Structure 1
Amino acid sequence: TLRAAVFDLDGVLALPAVFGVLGRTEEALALPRGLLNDAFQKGGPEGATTRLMKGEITLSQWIPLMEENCRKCSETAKVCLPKNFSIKEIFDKAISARKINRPMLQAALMLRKKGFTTAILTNTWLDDRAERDGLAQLMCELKMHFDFLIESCQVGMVKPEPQIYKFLLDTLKASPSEVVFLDDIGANLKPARDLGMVTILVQDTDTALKELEKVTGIQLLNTPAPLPTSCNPSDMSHGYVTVKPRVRLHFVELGSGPAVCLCHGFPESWYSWRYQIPALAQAGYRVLAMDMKGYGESSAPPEIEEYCMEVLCKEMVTFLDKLGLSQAVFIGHDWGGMLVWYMALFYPERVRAVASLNTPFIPANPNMSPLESIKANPVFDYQLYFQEPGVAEAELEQNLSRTFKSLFRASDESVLSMHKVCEAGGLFVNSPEEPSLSRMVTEEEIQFYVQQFKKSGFRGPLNWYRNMERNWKWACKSLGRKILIPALMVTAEKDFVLVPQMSQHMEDWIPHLKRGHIEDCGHWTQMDKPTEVNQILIKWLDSDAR
């Protein structure tokens, strides 16, 4: 029956409400209880505030008008407004103190997830204050989660005029008995009830959600901690830079602030960063999530030499050049992790800070060829299988769905042993044709990967494994150096290839190395434990990179 949920901003999706500054200021300054609310409301439908809410006048135009009303009100209540009394001040402070009511957003999210059309309907104002960006930021953080945002000052109507509820219904394409509307102000509920909407008067958050729980029949309170916000590919800004004649690099870009460049592993995609991209933009950073050379919409020349790290690196530098970026933070996972450590070692002027998930930094051994080295660790048997051009492409390109459904699994979900891959004759030799879906990924998320790899298959991705000798010669040049720029290493308890212990010597080369560690976390760090990864990266960024 119910199909739509409507939330007010002030007092409902954001707290404390700014009305509750008129109350507290009055107490705090020992003025007549209600004096400020009366001045705020002066003149009713024709007073300064309604014209503000209707978009007739801007906030800065209103400030003095409210001032005059506060003067009138005090003259007739025979009190003095204090010295240095400032409506700009009271309102600046109130407006920057309002934060998202997290439990309320979360409930909105959940109902949107079970199919409700959600909307914010709010009496707001055209904000031209010097400090207006604060409110611009909150509104951005809020609106992305809703189907509609209806602002009094944009549509020229206000709660509780009946016409805005008609505007609302018409926007939702819903009849009034299909709608729950929450407000903290009863008068604003009134006309919604007249049309027969379910209404909720929001005093404390928990009680409003309990009423919301009961009326929608959807569990909203006490629910499991939800995932971080993900990316809808076709809502992203997509960016393309030609770093040289045959080679273009694609990336997705979100946020303002210091540039932070995410480098995915084998065989992944910018999409592997879907859970970090919102949260880092949110935490004040300019996220550039790449398709690394060989994948997705980035170019994928055939030749093996196009994928040695010396060339991959120079290319990432050119990418900064053409974007006009002097530096960026490089954060990598798996292959991307190996590459960012080499960015630190060969171009520290370009790297603001370096971070890797799973991949330790390990120096070249100038005494031992790296193919020989590789045979010393059975767990790296798969890297030998990848050598012969053609062999691994054919297994991996055979069934793309099967491929990703097989590879992308939690630590307790593994359907393949990395043991004796060459002997057995393939990575998937003893795994299912139709593997169950991992708990980590939806059917759709697998298909996006599938579609990506339809562009260029696995030749380019595999080539990364095919320059061992050439990379070793180049790495040997870096044996005299240390990474002295800020740097974070994040180990994953249950990555059975890139085990935590592999990283135990890193302090010999990177003496001021910071660490973080995720428990019960397989190889696919970013989607396995997205929350924990976001917190470790944002805490490190705020301290080492800001």
Structure 2
Amino acid sequence: TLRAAVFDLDGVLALPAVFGVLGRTEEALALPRGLLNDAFQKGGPEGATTRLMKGEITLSQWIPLMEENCRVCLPKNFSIKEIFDKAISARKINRPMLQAALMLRKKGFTTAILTNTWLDDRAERDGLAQLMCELKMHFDFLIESCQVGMVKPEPQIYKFLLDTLKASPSEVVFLDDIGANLKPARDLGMVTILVQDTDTALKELEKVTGIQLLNTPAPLPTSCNPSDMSHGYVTVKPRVRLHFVELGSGPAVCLCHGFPESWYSWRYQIPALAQAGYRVLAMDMKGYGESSAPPEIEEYCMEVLCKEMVTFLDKLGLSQAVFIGHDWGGMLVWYMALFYPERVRAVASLNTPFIPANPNMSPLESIKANPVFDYQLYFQEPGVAEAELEQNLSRTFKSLFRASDESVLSMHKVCEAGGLFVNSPEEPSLSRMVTEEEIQFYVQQFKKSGFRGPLNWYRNMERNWKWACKSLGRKILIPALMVTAEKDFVLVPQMSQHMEDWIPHLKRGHIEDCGHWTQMDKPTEVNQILIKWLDSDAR
């Protein structure tokens, strides 16, 4: 039975192939047929191309050698450099091929990329570096000819492949677009697939593995494995350290989760935003995960939380970041925009609207007026909600993290009922949004500090109201995005209806059939909305 799948890069995981560029160049320049593809393979195993592929020489050293092999006289302005630059640049990931490799790995397969490639020292080498970065992360192994000093079709590279896989040949599927490179794998006893068009190749792959790879439902975006992330720690004041996970390069994007969450609530956004060209900083907010959790209520007022986030930027040497928040994180991000506009490149909130403080009413009065905000009154008394939320962590997270159609907690008459989970099962079912392993990650994070620091975010109503009143004459004039979720029955879309009075240039996003837990309920759509907005408004 098959347990490993091997993919070539050129013409398999990445399209169009280079062989399908030299042929097109010959045609465009009306040169004799196969001239360029012959100069490319001249000298065979002893030629300049084999030396390049084995890592003996770099791509920039290979360019003049390819020109000599090319020397029916060639045109006036010919450049092997220009042809190869354009070819490499045009080559993109073959998304359905990658999707099939992802599915096989998800089902227990060991996956690998085996490729005849070069050491790229061209001034434009970053393009290919980025491509390989994106692809390699999805595979157990990447075997490059220039790094191993062996090339396909040499029999040694196939034995090297089997040794790295720790598998017998009959346990391996080998996909390649070059018949000659497929030949040694077959002779060894491996299942082989000659890749011409992707669809046929995947039909052959589905037939041999017995796993559905074609016509499959839309896959979820790439997630995060906590142990594979870069973890950052900044002391913002003597007893307060902030933890964050960091991925990517480009403009800084600071992700701020809500209650009772984690940096991990952004797991589907972190790889997507980094791939989109941003440096993502996903915070554990004060009171959570690996960040400090002081017990004092006042340590969690918006004024102090915002000051600490400014100190966080100061210590990392960041003059600005784009701030994206959800729930309490969304509230924080609007206040960062109002009090520290110079430090905020742009601001986006998921679910949480911007509603100016009412100076003519106490915040307690305003919360009491809306039945859906009853849970916030239940959270007021120190110790009550901590005891209910800390009693059984697995039950807490399984009851909370549910999609709109999954018997979501009721939040009216929480005080009258005497708790959030009083009418909830002791062993709730697992939501379609989360795996048991994801629930256990939140359980392990909350074992450190519990719910005191997180609940304290709700315990500064009067303090936050007095601070917010200082901003009543201001408008938000920096780039801003409000994302509403149709089925969030607490942070309803309608609550955001007057935002343009205070944020005149506001841009919007709206997600249908989306509950409170936006990032994990609808990850693909969140990613689409945020990336589109970042690329147009945040640079």
Provide the TM-score with structure 1 as the length reference: 0.98
SS in 2 for 1:466: coil
Deviations 1:155-203 (A, max 9, x none): 0000000000000000000000000000000000000000110000000
- Matches of 2:178 and 2:190 in 1, distance apart? 16
Deviations 1:415-463 (A, max 9, x none): 4211111111101111000000001000000000000000000000000
SS in 2 for 1:517: strand
2:125 to 121, 132, 139: 132
- Matches of 1:415 and 1:9 in 2, distance apart? 45
Deviations 1:16-57 (A, max 9, x none): 001111110000100010000110000000100000000000
Q: Answer yes or no: is the 8 Å Cα contact 1:489–1:515 preserved in 2.
A: yes
Deviations 1:268-305 (A, max 9, x none): 00000000000000000000000000000000000000
Gaps of 5+ in 2: none
Residue aligning to 1:243: 236
Give the CA deviation at 1:80. Answer: 1.1
- Matches of 1:528 and 1:381 in 2, distance apart? 24
- Matches of 1:175 and 1:530 in 2, distance apart? 39
RMSD: 0.4
- Matches of 2:367 and 2:201 in 1, distance apart? 60
- Matches of 1:456 and 1:84 in 2, distance apart? 68
Q: Answer yes or no: is the 8 Å Cα contact 1:360–1:506 preserved in 2.
A: yes
- Matches of 2:481 and 2:76 in 1, distance apart? 52
- Matches of 1:191 and 1:424 in 2, distance apart? 71
SS in 2 for 1:166: helix
Deviations 1:459-480 (A, max 9, x none): 0000000000000000000000
SS in 2 for 1:121: strand
SS in 2 for 1:302: coil
Tell me, yes or no, if structure 1 residue 374 matches structure 2 residue 362.
no
Residue aligning to 1:82: 75
Q: Answer yes or no: is the 8 Å Cα contact 1:358–1:491 preserved in 2.
A: yes
Residue aligning to 2:25: 25
SS in 1 for 2:399: helix
Q: Answer yes or no: is the 8 Å Cα contact 1:53–1:153 preserved in 2.
A: yes
Deviations 1:100-150 (A, max 9, x none): 000000000000010100000000000000000000000000000000000
Q: Answer yes or no: is the 8 Å Cα contact 1:486–1:545 preserved in 2.
A: yes
Provide the TM-score with structure 2 as the length reference: 1.00
- Matches of 1:84 and 1:306 in 2, distance apart? 69
- Matches of 2:64 and 2:499 in 1, distance apart? 62
1:307 to 295, 300, 324: 300
Q: Answer yes or no: is the 8 Å Cα contact 1:415–1:431 preserved in 2.
A: no
Residue aligning to 1:7: 7
Deviations 1:232-268 (A, max 9, x none): 0000000000000000000000000000000000000
SS in 2 for 1:465: coil
SS in 1 for 2:243: strand
- Matches of 1:480 and 1:286 in 2, distance apart? 33
2:519 to 520, 526, 542: 526
- Matches of 1:83 and 1:114 in 2, distance apart? 55
Give the CA deviation at 1:414. Answer: 2.5
Tell me, yes or no, if structure 1 residue 111 matches structure 2 residue 104.
yes
Deviations 1:365-405 (A, max 9, x none): 00000001110001000101111100110000000000000
Moved over 6 A (4+): none
- Matches of 2:409 and 2:366 in 1, distance apart? 24
Tell me, yes or no, if structure 1 residue 201 matches structure 2 residue 194.
yes
Residue aligning to 2:48: 48
- Matches of 1:419 and 1:388 in 2, distance apart? 17
- Matches of 2:517 and 2:345 in 1, distance apart? 25
2:411 to 402, 407, 418: 418
Residue aligning to 2:65: 65
Give the number of aligned pairs. 539
Q: Answer yes or no: is the 8 Å Cα contact 1:259–1:285 preserved in 2.
A: yes
Deviations 1:80-112 (A, max 9, x none): 100110000000000010000000000000000
SS in 2 for 1:289: strand
- Matches of 2:27 and 2:408 in 1, distance apart? 65
Q: Answer yes or no: is the 8 Å Cα contact 1:107–1:209 preserved in 2.
A: yes
- Matches of 1:416 and 1:216 in 2, distance apart? 42
- Matches of 1:193 and 1:505 in 2, distance apart? 67
Give the CA deviation at 1:230. Answer: 0.1
- Matches of 1:470 and 1:358 in 2, distance apart? 23
- Matches of 2:330 and 2:408 in 1, distance apart? 25
Residue aligning to 2:147: 154
- Matches of 1:198 and 1:275 in 2, distance apart? 34
